[model samples]
Target: WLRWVTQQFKTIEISLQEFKAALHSFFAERFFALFRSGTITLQELQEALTSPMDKLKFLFQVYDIDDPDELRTVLQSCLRESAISLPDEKLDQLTLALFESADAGAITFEELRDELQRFVMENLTISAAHWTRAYWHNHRSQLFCLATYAGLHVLLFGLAASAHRDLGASVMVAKGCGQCLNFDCSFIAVLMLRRCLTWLRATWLAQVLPLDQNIQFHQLMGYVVVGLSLVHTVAHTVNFVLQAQGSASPTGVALLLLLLLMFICSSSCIRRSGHFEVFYWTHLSYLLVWLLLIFHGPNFWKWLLVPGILFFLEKAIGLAVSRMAAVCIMEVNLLPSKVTHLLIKRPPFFHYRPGDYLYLNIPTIARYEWHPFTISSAPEQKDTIWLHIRSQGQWTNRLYESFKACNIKCYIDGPYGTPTRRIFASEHAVLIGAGIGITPFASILQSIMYRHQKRKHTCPSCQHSWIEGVQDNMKLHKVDFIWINRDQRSFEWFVSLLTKLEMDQAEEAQYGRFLELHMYMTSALKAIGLQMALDLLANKEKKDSITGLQTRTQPGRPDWSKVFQKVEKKGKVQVFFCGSPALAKVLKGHCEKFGFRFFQENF
Candidate 1:
């Protein structure tokens, strides 16, 4: 009977191992097929496979296949073999189709995802050519719309204000004809009132809202504001010209125009050229303009301009706060490979969400010079956070040595970004990280893991039973992670971590969810090949490829049905991206089609 029991136990062990291996193979095969057939891009594939908290239950349903290295290798091979080379023209058509589909603005996520999968499988391409074309086109259109709106507003305001001055001068001359009525004082008063409103609007909307997304809009608005101010100066000059002829006291008009000219010229230079010192000078020039406006318009009601003064003063306060926020002393701990983690401490704590950025002002080099980096530490732990810096630029290259030699003290101004906590709040979370972009997500995942560990031992109680029940829940949150790097050397440092996480052996709680990680290397590919097809069409050498390819190629390309079949098996997933803006934009299009909301961190 004892021997029989032993044999039974051995049989059970064998059965369990076989079951685990089969499960691993099943999910791996499905995921691989989806990725290769172009049903999922590298970004989508990563999110689906590695996210620790994905809504897609099937993604982590497998108990056996936990090695990220194995998954990475398989996916890489699939991508490499499947990548089909296409000429520039065929690429453009595909891109245009994709963008047009996106522009319809009503495409369902499932429909879009299916369509993209079909396109990718048919084309067998993995580069970002299609995405770059679409983004530049979109960006250009947004810029044009914003610029036109600002220009029209400026012109209308300028004309209305000028009319008041013209009317006032005519009145003082005793010309009271209906058409040529001397309403110069009324004109000037109306102009001042209009100026106040316009400046307020600029401050509230143009300077603040859409500031980051629309650089061109901001640039044009600054120019338009300056142009209107110039018109105001010109009108005052004409008034002075009339007064010098023994018509009125030209002294105030002359002085105001000169000061206006000085303010306008200084503001224009500062706005156009981004010279902070010049900006400082121009800010002072505003005080002179404010003083003149007060003297010229003496009524207490004219003190409405005082609010405008307050507005400018608030801007000044904002600048000072930003400077104070920027000050910090960072101790960079360099590790093997190119990885360097930073430790920063300052006042009020750096309040940042998962994917926020900071512009580091390295005083060791110069006070004015700064570089932006993504914060890799969790937001909840405000006392200290890490920034993983890859030695790329001149500023970053000197970071390690500067810290040692200068005992480098710097300022980290920002903690600026649209909050991305929503990404984590969702039922699923997918992270696509290229190089250092991975840092932010790393913090987010680690925080989740830590929280999970902290709550591991608690029992379900009545009042907090819901929380306790959740704590004991073993359903793994689907985490799809994609790490895109240029070379094997670049990936070597991270490969071990990937390997451990895949096996479910890296630090994790008993009831906590599993994490999935995927790595994609597109170093052999050129972005222009994927991005500049339309631009290439303009050249004679590229023209033949476009026209000729259209005539020869069939519309029905490679079918990625197999790829979709595989990914669908994993379940539902969401995508979060941190990488090049071009890549993020394109991946967002793909994810959106799949009914996944794409969240991006601009670093």
Candidate 2:
């Protein structure tokens, strides 16, 4: 009888076999049984789970959890006082389907019913427009590369056309030197041009422009320069050196060697190391690399002028804007997993949003060095901005130590990064963070809570002084936050903040459970044991000590297929991830399978 009517899958309009083929696991047979019993209308059972919070009301009603908290009593009460136990196999299957764990063993109908409602609520909403715009996705990066090439190509050919006959029309060797050297210099300029654009991306003043990723145009140009410059030096320009009679000074040769050192320092081998000092200091060659290049061939200096000027402009802007400012070290907490939490004041008039990052130059720690860290406090209201520093390298290590008694001044520039503007654009958002990578989302979650709290007290329709050049956050229906960390103790790092949000949810139910925090602990394999032991006794799970929330820490990696399908996204999902490349890659795979968009601020 059950199999007779199971041929058609209703609204989705697919066969049971087709549904099985589409995904990894299947919903239990009881899902259809509920339909036969007339518990839910066909309309209530479709992929229209609007949002988790919105549909949870259905879970409460249908599961009869809303009635009371007893097992058989509440069950029979909802069922008109005539209820019986489920068959052994059916209950087991249903429990496993709701939460793929041993927790299912001791679970009753209400728990399974609650979870399955959410699973059913997890609807498929895939947008086709996300694909239509792929052609111009990197369009900004494209135009700049073309312009850089043109500047280099045009200038070299310009000089070559007007040079001495052999150097120009017929002085093939000297003329070829003009093209070779000119082309190489243009790329060098492109490197500097890229630098200007990099700063342009960071400044709050220019927040209107888009800068999600940096261009490798300069690197490609560098490759072209390296290839052609070798030939120019070995085969032809050697004649020009002989032609000029020691025209290139020892200073020029020394700077040339310095340039080589800079490139060598920037190579994959040196950059991949933990000691960043070599790469950091070698970049100081910029102070004189161009100066020497210009003087060596005063005639060719004109070609190098554009990149040189742009480089200085970026440097000057960074220095001038943040000469120095005093900021009290609000507090410093030594956190688990080699993390340091620093709370400090943002200089007067400094403003930044949740996703923006800042470059800090603490002269006392490392006089000439500046390192970037994302701002972890909310933009809506902030007295002290927070930075989570992990001892990733030498600079950050010294930074953590120096902040022990840190009541000092530091230079700060930028509230940068084009963190998914789609945060405000999409109807749903999935914030995925790993360990220290969770810093950026701290501000985002806080801002959502703050703004909504503020919005609750005031009128339903008004604008807050949100970030400019973007729409407000009204489109956001729900934000699903998933945090994955290895250490079980690591959850305590920001438990206070999460606790406050939970407290707000309980005290003021109107604020909504807009923020759902899911934590996965890789270090604690013991979590499984808890579930294992609990399954034996068939008991409920415990809550966190600090958070006081019902959700406990789950061990191991997140079930990606389960995670994506659970979040109900209506439009294009702005999925933000900040973590190891391996984790980001995995999340991205799940996103594609579920047909949602993926964004990563990768380490």
Candidate 3:
């Protein structure tokens, strides 16, 4: 019967109006079933339909709503109680087919319904294993191949160029012999340059593209940087010998050697090691090498070297500024784990954006050791900031111990991370946080609330709400929020804040209140629910159901459709997540599944 229905509509293209009608039919049927079964009250069913537009919006985004028949069929099939009982494997196959149909442009409602019925009846499952098998890990291999080819071409050109030039000894070589005797100085500079490029490439590649499975790419990059330095030593030794035999130009030769060294040493300190102070000093050493190059290299080559030199200087300055902005003092008057709430006064005049982090040096315990932690206080908070540092690592342990003993003093250096606040501009946002990763989100949410409250009077009717409405002309923009935590305590803390905002908004629609907020515990729904909510909020269609357990004919305890409808009608959603690599992988999968974009900050 399903196959015949699919075949009949296979050739017909679906339209938006037809798609909406199909959805209405499906939802009505589903609601009636629940009401008849006596499992759900009429009020509950009515509340479920409160945001009918949002439900339709979610369907549109998940499936290609342009195809009326496809939309109608999928709704009819999947909306039934029997469809939820399908085997996991069969369900996945049907889901993939639905995705492919949408990818191709248009699929009729009948075709969609048939596929959904098959998905439910067969109980199919979709897993990361499917995607992993589709593509080979080739990014690193491609980069290495390209680099090798470029190097070979450069070497061939240099050798040919050298062979064609005449080497005639002159009085200039003899006069500059004394200056050329400084071989050690020249060797050091050349070695520094070679090491810098090698390490820089390795670090970049490791961060952006995985080089291989076994090797830690960043560490390998560090070694390559060091190895290049050694190579620079060998090259300089050979040059010194040539000068001893009066074969190389004194000023020109020394200048070229120093230029290479300056470039190399500039990036040597950027490794995952404890010697940050030494790294800072070594970074500054490049300036001396640059000055030497400017004096020695010919006027013609200086232009080529000028850009490189300026870039290095710019990066160095940026690094210094970042470090200077790092000192943050959190007076935790309320440390739930230890005590509760204290005033924290950070260094004066330092600033940071949402999602940035700092490396803290506890002078009371060990001044030299620095531990990284995310800044949990907004920049607007001013003079004071917060860091909910759990005693996890060696540095943090010592710092915690010291705080327990007495007031602990610490020096902070850093405020580093790619800008993340730009993500708020997205139509819908989802945040996935595990353990202490929730700190950054707290800061961000508070900051957003503060801003919304400040502008509430001016922008009333805005999706968000602030305090009280002062006049008839005021409005506020609404923002959606989602929180995932592990325990009841965490959930309660978040809910308290949300309830407060809800009450504040209810008093007067100053700024719109948070449209929706979800708290997911240890379940993997942290990812699944996030994706569904985001898709609904963005008015995009959801791709498939992500069931952590075996597929069933009946829906789960939490009706995802109901949760999605409420949030979608409120406003745009934005997602932010912090957690373990494993959780991140799951979150990433769901994000891709729903076609929702995401940005991550791993601590």
Candidate 4:
């Protein structure tokens, strides 16, 4: 019977309206069951027929599904045609809830119809036009920056052409392209002043500026310069070829070659490959580009003066601060999967917010090579900081291997701010970390727990009175932390921290589950059998079999749309994700669907 129903739904159809007609036909054919089940009253039947979703009501009443297994299967078959999807455990739980809503008998028509209506409403997808509009609305600041930059380039090019009317159209076009290229060549430096931008992000100016997109803007400027250079080079080459007495300058040829080399080496193919050093060293040849620019375009110096000075100043400050800070590799622990955990002594008076990262340089390992790592320890832990390094890249693998052989000294350059700093302002913040990406949130979760402990107030007069309420500086009321790992052992990296957090929250059980944790394992051998056992035991014991935390580990990737739907009722939400680019795009889309703000870690 179930196979026939599923087959009927999957048959070739002309339209969705036709599909609804088929559903009504199925109900008419099975009307005998509707009259046999006398639980549904005549008035209830009449009301359902006259209601907005009459087809769904008729179908449920006609089926008279009493067995929970049959009801669950029917609902699953119906939803297979809809966008709604649920994990096996959640689906089973929801089925039981629907079955039990009727106190004395089988599922009623009203219960089935209401739940089906909800599924229909939640499955309603946003149109392409609406999504595109929301995307621009969400990224208005970025759009404004791009428009302003493009508008200025056009104005400069037009004005340059007007100023050189006497120089025929050929040279005038070439000169205009050169003028714009000069601005781009120099302006790109301002986008790369990482230390300066990091400081700016902490101020109110960050609200008006898309400071988070500095790297993207730098890459944008590079492409603009390259485009303008091609045009400038072609026009000048044509002019030189026609003049017969003149040729392209050697400085121009050298600068073009250097720029091409940098552009090619900076591509995703080169940067994402194992040998990042090739891209890094080749990109440093910008100094040579600037030197050649001095000879190629005499006016380039004027454009570079202020930005160049500021760039040098930023480097000088970073160098001095990193050198003066005294830090050591106090302890090293090698964990499963080549993860190196480093404990470093925190410098006195050196304070940073949770989720901030610092650039580390070890003279012995590689003196000039500085790499950024998220500080895994909370700021409240004043004397020490933690860094979890995974052996994936060339420099990172070497760092792990070096730690195994011996200890080393390292310098700290910055405690830079990231998008995660906005978590305080958010009423409900969702932190997602995939695999090793959990390092940033490790600091944040610990800091949040510590802050909660500090907020506790005890009464002196009363023997057993405790007061804990909202604090002035904290607006964050709830956090949903989702951590995904491919296998079981990866959980070992932060299992202890999670266990401690679970214990701390257990003591204050009455305050509601202020922090919710969702752990997912994407690859588990014989996962179905293991998950069934896990659910049975966890439901009975209130402890997960894998992490031993109160939260059970989910066995597959989350249905992001369902995740967002759960949070949709929450008043205000901000989602911060640290993971691979592929999943980042997926989360960003769902966040937009729910009208929630989305932030992704760039580094």
Q: Which candidate is the best by TM-score?
A: 4
Instruction: Measure candidate 2: CA RMSD.
Output: 14.9
- Give the per-residue lDDT of model 4 (tens digit) for 1-603: 758544544541123433443232332234433433344234433343233455555555555543554444534443432212334655555455445543235556676556555424332211111119987776663457777898999999999999888986689989899999988988888788767766787665774455655768889899989988988999988987878862238888899999999999988777445555677688899999998888778688999999998888888875565545768888888897788888898888787888888888777656556667888899899878998887777677776776676357788865777545567776777777774556777788898888877877767788566756667645676788776666545446786687778767877777566777777666432201113223444665567544567876654566643574466234477777765545766778766776766665432
CA lDDT, every prediction?
Answer: 0.45, 0.55, 0.44, 0.67
Clashes of each: 39, 7, 75, 0
Q: In candidate 4, residue 184 scores what lDDT? A: 93
Clashing pairs in 2: 165-170, 165-171, 166-170, 166-171, 167-171, 167-175, 486-523
Candidate 4, residue 71: CA error in Å? 25
Superior candidate under TM-score, 2 versus 4: 4
lDDT of 3 by residue, 1-603 (tens): 757444534422123323432332444333234323344233533333333334433343344423444434444445432223234444444544545644444444444444344323232221112115323344443345437534643564455345534543332232233122232233333323322333443354544533232223333333443444345445456656877984234554554455455445544344323444444465555456445544553332334354565455644653435444444344544344432222357676566777666665554555444455667666678767666566444445444554564254556664655455454455445444465556566666666656655654544567564446323321224555544455434233334445555445444444334434554433332101113212222223221232221111122223432333333422344444555444555555555554444554333
Q: Against the hidden reference, what TM-scores do the models get?
A: 0.45, 0.54, 0.40, 0.60
Report the Cα lDDT for residue 120, model 3: 31
Relative to the true structure, candidate 3 reaches a TM of 0.40
Q: Can you tell me which runs of candidate 3 are displaced by over 4 Å?
A: 1-219, 225-308, 311-343, 346-373, 379-383, 389-439, 451-477, 483-515, 520-567, 571-603
Error of 2 at 105 (Å): 21
